[PDB]
Amino acid sequence: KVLKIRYPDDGEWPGAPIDKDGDGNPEFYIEINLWNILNATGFAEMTYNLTSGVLHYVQQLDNIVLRDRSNWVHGYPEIFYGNKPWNANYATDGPIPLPSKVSNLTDFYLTISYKLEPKNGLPINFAIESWLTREAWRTTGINSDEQAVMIWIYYDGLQPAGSKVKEIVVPIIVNGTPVNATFEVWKANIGWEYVAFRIKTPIKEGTVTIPYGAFISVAANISSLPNYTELYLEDVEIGTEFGTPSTTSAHLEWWITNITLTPLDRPLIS
Ligand SMILES: OC[C@H]1O[C@@H](O[C@@H]2[C@@H](O)[C@H](O)O[C@H](CO)[C@H]2O)[C@H](O)[C@@H](O)[C@@H]1O
Ligand SMILES: OC[C@H]1O[C@@H](O)[C@H](O)[C@@H](O)[C@@H]1O
Numbered sequence: 467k468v469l470k471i472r473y474p475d476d477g478e479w480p481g482a483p484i485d486k487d488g489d490g491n492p493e494f495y496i497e498i499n500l501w502n503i504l505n506a507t508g509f510a511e512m513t514y515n516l517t518s519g520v521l522h523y524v525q526q527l528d529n530i531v532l533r534d535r536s537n538w539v540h541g542y543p544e545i546f547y548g549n550k551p552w553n554a555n556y557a558t559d560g561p562i563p564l565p566s567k568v569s570n571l572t573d574f575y576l577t578i579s580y581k582l583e584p585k586n587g588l589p590i591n592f593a594i595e596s597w598l599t600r601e602a603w604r605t606t607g608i609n610s611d612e613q614a615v616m617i618w619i620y621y622d623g624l625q626p627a628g629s630k631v632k633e634i635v636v637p638i639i640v641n642g643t644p645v646n647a648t649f650e651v652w653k654a655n656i657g658w659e660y661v662a663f664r665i666k667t668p669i670k671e672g673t674v675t676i677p678y679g680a681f682i683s684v685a686a687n688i689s690s691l692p693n694y695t696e697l698y699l700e701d702v703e704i705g706t707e708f709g710t711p712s713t714t715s716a717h718l719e720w721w722i723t724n725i726t727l728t729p730l731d732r733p734l735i736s
């Protein structure tokens with residue numbers, strides 16, 4: 467009734483499926499994903515209680531040495547739905563058919579209930595990420611004619627990659643109240659096109675609903691990629707990037723109590 471994964475005990479890449487009905491198709495998949503840490507003392511552990519539905523991440527890392535300082539952040543511990551295109555991990559037991567071509571997908575709301583506790587000024591964000599690839603089921607990484615979209619609904623001490631492009635308004639719901647929120651749009655080229663939406667009023671805890679197609683429509687419109695609507699929306703990942711090249715100690719704890727994807731009866735891109 468409790469799933470647990472732990473770094474470094476389970477290796478340098480701990481991860482596990484959440485498959486509550488035991489049917490062999492995970493509803494979500496979790497990864498500790500310390501992708502840019504070469505070595506650290508301490509541990510990071512992610513627990514999911516299958517009765518309460520609470521996902522709890524506890525991280526206490528020190529003596530951090532990065533794989534490549536130019537990649538800036540240290541890792542992105544996360545939970546995701548769909549096909550993560552960097553590896554053979556996937557979760558497709560849900561109402562939205564990911565992966566699917568962006569030209570064929572309906573819009574959906576993404577609602578997350580969570581609480582973030584970075585310790586001692588640790589730079590972090592809480593970001594939702596999607597990869598858009600040329601093939602339907604990619605498992606070996608990302609090419610220069612493909613896109614990452616990120617949506618940061620909390621941050622402290624981290625700036626997205628690239629250059630600011632603009633500000634957009636997006637209607638969201640925060641703690642039960644519909645509100646017009648502002649997101650900065652940032653664009654970079656980092657081996658693939660990266661577009662990040664960073665909220666101007668970070669939300670450290672609570673329940674937030676966002677309309678996914680507002681973000682993907684803007685990422686499509688500012689993209690330099692050809693044939694954007696042929697790309698497949700592989701996944702929806704939710705996690706915390708953390709750290710900078712001068713962070714040597716990273717203590718952080720967070721919780722997620724609910725992720726819901728709600729299909730709408732309208733195209734993703736408008
Ligand atoms: O390396 C990928 C990560 O880049 C992070 O942005 C960095 C900026 O904060 C910093 O000022 O510049 C460096 C080098 O240009 C950037 O890499 C993004 O915050 C992360 O989302 C991204 O994964
Ligand atoms: O930066 C490239 C990518 O590295 C992979 O190893 C990680 O699992 C991804 O989350 C990350 O985005």
Ligand SMILES: [Ca+2]
Pocket residue numbers: 484485486487488489490491492493559
């Ligand atoms: Ca299942």
Ligand SMILES: [Ca+2]
Pocket residue numbers: 549550551552553554555556604605
């Ligand atoms: Ca995968």
